[PDB]
Design an enzyme around this catalytic site. Structure first.
Site, PDB file in Angstrom:
ATOM      1  N   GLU D  45       0.810  -1.221   0.000  1.00  0.00           N
ATOM      2  CA  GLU D  45       0.000   0.000   0.000  1.00  0.00           C
ATOM      3  C   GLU D  45       0.843   1.271   0.000  1.00  0.00           C
ATOM      4  O   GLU D  45       0.485   2.262  -0.636  1.00  0.00           O
ATOM      5  CB  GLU D  45      -0.935   0.024   1.214  1.00  0.00           C
ATOM      6  CG  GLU D  45      -1.916  -1.128   1.282  1.00  0.00           C
ATOM      7  CD  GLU D  45      -1.384  -2.305   2.076  1.00  0.00           C
ATOM      8  OE1 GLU D  45      -0.430  -2.961   1.604  1.00  0.00           O
ATOM      9  OE2 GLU D  45      -1.918  -2.568   3.176  1.00  0.00           O
ATOM     10  N   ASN D  46       1.960   1.238   0.721  1.00  0.00           N
ATOM     11  CA  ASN D  46       2.822   2.410   0.848  1.00  0.00           C
ATOM     12  C   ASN D  46       3.509   2.787  -0.467  1.00  0.00           C
ATOM     13  O   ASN D  46       4.213   3.796  -0.534  1.00  0.00           O
ATOM     14  CB  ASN D  46       3.858   2.189   1.958  1.00  0.00           C
ATOM     15  CG  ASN D  46       4.555   0.850   1.855  1.00  0.00           C
ATOM     16  OD1 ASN D  46       3.992  -0.119   1.347  1.00  0.00           O
ATOM     17  ND2 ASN D  46       5.781   0.782   2.364  1.00  0.00           N
TER      18      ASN D  46
END
EC number: 2.8.3.8
Lengths: 212, 215, 215, 213
Positions: D45-46
């Site tokens: 996600e990052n």
């Protein structure tokens, strides 16, 4: 010479470090009259900053017109979403565009002529809606002699209430807090000439032609 | 398993009535071989989405000239008189959208967004047939996402996983249409091995790329 | 003048009650010196916007621990018990926003858009106080743009024009907050010459960068 | 070993070439049970694709949990807008997330428990609305013995009508056209135990425990 005085005057308006967009036609001439010490960065709609003249032509490097151009040191490439994120997001300090018609309500028409085939608006609408300063560089009257600075645009609008500065070879107009102001008159011209050749309703600055 | 495919096999993806997104700005960034293959396939009734209709002999021009397109969605058509004539005559439907709006519609289509609010086109003919919302005392046009059946992409470098980089102003629409189409075909100038493209240099990750055209 | 300035100068940009965007995911991508400088300024009543509150001793944590923040807008605060403690206590206000929504709000703020439609949060507490629109038979939350007075950015490499590159997972929010804030401060790991960053490698163009912290 | 059987079963669900997202906790274990010939690409996600185990720790490289990780050859970096453009845009073939509660209406709750401190939703909401397949990897009952597979979630929802597959150490449920189906039962377990340990209303597949092509 008219186009050149317009371009030169518009060039005198730009500030050092400004991010500028120059439309095809008259506005590019602005690039040739930047005063000494004034350095700007040109943005190209097709997606890059640091536009410049051709050095060695490259097939994958063109301007918004699709014609071969170049870049300066420190140029940056990006996609169209980023490009119009910049343009629409107010990251363009100034845009200089041509014009077919402008009116007292600061409306603009410059992407289509009724009776001529329609080319499309391209990025003009985003540019005039997004730019921090919208400068229109255009001749005062059309080739038939009719006024182009009107009470209300008759041609299809590029945008409404978007013009901040109008630069002609006879005069300079500014739109301030909704009202249209005549702030400068060109040498060899008179107030009656500007009034006569302008259908738009405008107020004249009291301190016309004085030092600041 | 491989993403590598020949141009002749790729033609299998072309069909009548299909909607296709094509990369390139004024033809710069358009996959030539894919367009030629699409033309050679003989498919008609196409709906093309691109920044423009380019010139007669470049971009999606040849497809328009040979009457393989019934509808166009773009922002500019001035450099191709054929587009204009077929527009006027009625042979072709043309939707002129502000460039910044069009690219955001494509992005929305690719990013799973239901639409966006833009001030571009307010008070113009672009506003026609669209919903307007008032927010912060400002009027906005509500613009909706655009997707397509297929995307024809050009890249500079491309590895076997489909990671793409682009060169100069040939990028433009390519990175966005890659996310907005059901199937994606890329035509790389150069095919490299996995690892030759640095993680921080890749513009379009290979996840959204389905097939790679072999030279 | 110039965009290059010492860290000591950065304190001039800080003031009470201002809203600040801070880059980094779980502290990774946070400008440490700018944050430590922001702490040293003694400014309070801050509204911080970031992906998360990181740990107590990293990210925007130290600012929260020393009670200089009144409001936080983020997607996760679990790894910082102090944020939660102060949230529960009442000393600090916290707005929990879905990550994909938050970043898009920032982007909208940066891209001059009036808002966007997202399916994320429909039927949840996220829907409360927000407009819901039906399009294509699907319900969407209408999310509004976010802007800030200041943005604290970390980059890997940076030239004197402010062109930025990022390293690995330290990118995250930084490229977006760069466009969404009135004034932008970048803390690059490495200062290079203009021309050392290739045009096709630059992620954030210098146009949106106002001030650069030197090595 | 329950978590391992769950992870093992979920791993068998993934197809070769899938773009997968694994939430923090149990789902991360799924990466340790991929069958032979099954190759996936993990999304973080990052902001990157090609997530993998640590090789040599790098300060600027961590997972969504902020812990040091690594990458595989051909990994790609990108910002958070792009990340959730991928996640929300349906470019994630499958996400595997933990769960506090799931119900017959395929609703999900897995970001907050009433009475405990709120950690935030992070990217869970985007993941479950956006992913093409939403797999929930969860123990059947809570540690206090309370049911977690309910008629209606009592805890705050992560999303509504989002779950496609629910995998526990006792059974596998699938949500198809609004209706909840018990499709598999774990060895050493029977239908009555699952029924007893489940408050959700579900129909049992007629061809339970049969070979398929």
């Amino acid at each position: 010479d008219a186009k050149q005085r317009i371009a030169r005057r518009v060039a005198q308006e730009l500030r050092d470090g400004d991010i500028v967009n120059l439309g095809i036609g008259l506005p590019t001439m602005v690039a040739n009259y930047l005063p000494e010490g004034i350095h700007i960065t040109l943005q190209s709609e097709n997606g890059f900053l640091g536009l410049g003249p051709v050095t060695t032509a490259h097939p994958d490097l063109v301007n918004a017109g699709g014609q071969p151009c170049g870049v300066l040191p420190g140029a940056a490439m990006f996609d169209s979403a980023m490009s119009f994120a910049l343009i629409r997001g107010g990251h363009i300090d100034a845009c200089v565009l041509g014009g077919l018609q402008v009116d007292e309500e600061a409306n603009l028409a410059n992407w289509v002529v009724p009776g001529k085939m329609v080319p499309g608006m391209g990025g003009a609408m985003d540019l005039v809606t997004g730019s921090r300063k919208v400068i229109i560089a255009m001749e005062h009257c059309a080739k038939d002699g009719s006024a182009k600075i009107l009470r209300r645009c008759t041609m299809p609008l590029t945008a409404q209430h978007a013009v901040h500065m109008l630069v002609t070879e006879l005069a300079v107009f500014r739109f301030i807090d909704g009202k249209m102001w005549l702030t400068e008159i060109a040498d060899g011209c008179d107030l009656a000439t500007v009034r006569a050749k302008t259908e738009a309703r405008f107020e004249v600055a009291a301190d016309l032609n004085t030092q600041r | 398993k491989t993403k590598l495919m020949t141009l002749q096999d790729a033609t299998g993806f072309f069909r009548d009535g299909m909607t296709i997104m094509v990369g390139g700005f004024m033809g710069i960034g358009t996959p030539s071989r894919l367009v030629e293959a699409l033309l050679e396939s003989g498919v008609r009734d196409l709906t093309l989405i691109a920044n423009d209709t380019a010139f007669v002999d470049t971009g999606i021009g040849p497809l328009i000239v040979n009457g393989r397109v019934r509808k166009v969605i773009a922002s500019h058509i001035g450099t191709n008189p054929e587009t204009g004539r077929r527009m006027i005559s009625g042979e072709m439907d043309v939707v002129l959208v502000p460039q910044g709006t069009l690219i955001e519609q494509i992005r929305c289509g690719g990013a799973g967004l239901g639409g966006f609010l833009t001030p571009t086109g307010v008070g113009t003919v672009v506003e026609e047939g669209k919903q307007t919302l008032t927010l912060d005392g400002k009027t906005w046009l509500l613009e909706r996402p655009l997707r397509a059946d297929l995307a024809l992409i050009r890249a500079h470098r491309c590895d076997t996983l489909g990671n793409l980089t682009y060169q100069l102003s040939a990028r433009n629409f390519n990175p966005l249409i890659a996310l907005a189409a059901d199937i994606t075909l890329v035509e790389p100038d150069e095919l490299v091995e996995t690892g030759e493209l640095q993680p921080d240099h890749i513009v379009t990750p290979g996840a959204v790329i389905d097939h790679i055209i072999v030279s």
